[PDB]
C-alpha cells in the first residue's frame, strides 16, 4: 500500500529497521505517506525518527505544519486501517503496530475512512 515498500525490498527495510532501533533507542522509525484516493496536500518528507514519548497529537501537529494545512482542514492518521488513539505516544503506537521490518507505517487523508 506504501510506495516505500515497493521501492525498497523487505530485506533492506528489516535490516535498516533493526539498525535504527539500535542507533536511536529513544526514538522509533515512522514512514508517513498519503492514503490512496485522498484529496489533501502533499507531504514532502516521509521518513521520521520521532521520540518514543512523543504523543500522536504532537506528531499530528508536526505533519499538519509540513503539509501547511489550514486551521479548518482535517488530517486523519491510519495505522493498519485504524485511526490511532490521539492520547497515545508514538512509542506505544510503534510497540503495538510496527511491521516485520520494524518500521511503523502511517497513512494520512482528509477523510476518516481508508
Amino acid at each position: 500500500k506504501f510506495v516505500y515498500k515497493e521501492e525498497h525490498p523487505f530485506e533492506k527495510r528489516r535490516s535498516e529497521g533493526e539498525k535504527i532501533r539500535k542507533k536511536y533507542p529513544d526514538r522509533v522509525p515512522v514512514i508517513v505517506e498519503k492514503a490512496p484516493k485522498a484529496r489533501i496536500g502533499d507531504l514532502d518528507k516521509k521518513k521520521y525518527l520521532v521520540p518514543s514519548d512523543l504523543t500522536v497529537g504532537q506528531f499530528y501537529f508536526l505533519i499538519r505544519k509540513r503539509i501547511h494545512l489550514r486551521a479548518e482542514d482535517a488530517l486523519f492518521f491510519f495505522v493498519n486501517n485504524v485511526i490511532p488513539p490521539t492520547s497515545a505516544t508514538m512509542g506505544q503506537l510503534y510497540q503495538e503496530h510496527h511491521e516485520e521490518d520494524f518500521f511503523l507505517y502511517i497513512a494520512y487523508s482528509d477523510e476518516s475512512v481508508y
Binding site: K47, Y48, L49, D53
Partner: peptide
Amino acid sequence: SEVDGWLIIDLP
C-alpha cells in the same frame, strides 16, 4: 536534520 533521509524530531 537528516541522516540518509530520516528526519530527526525533538520534543517540543
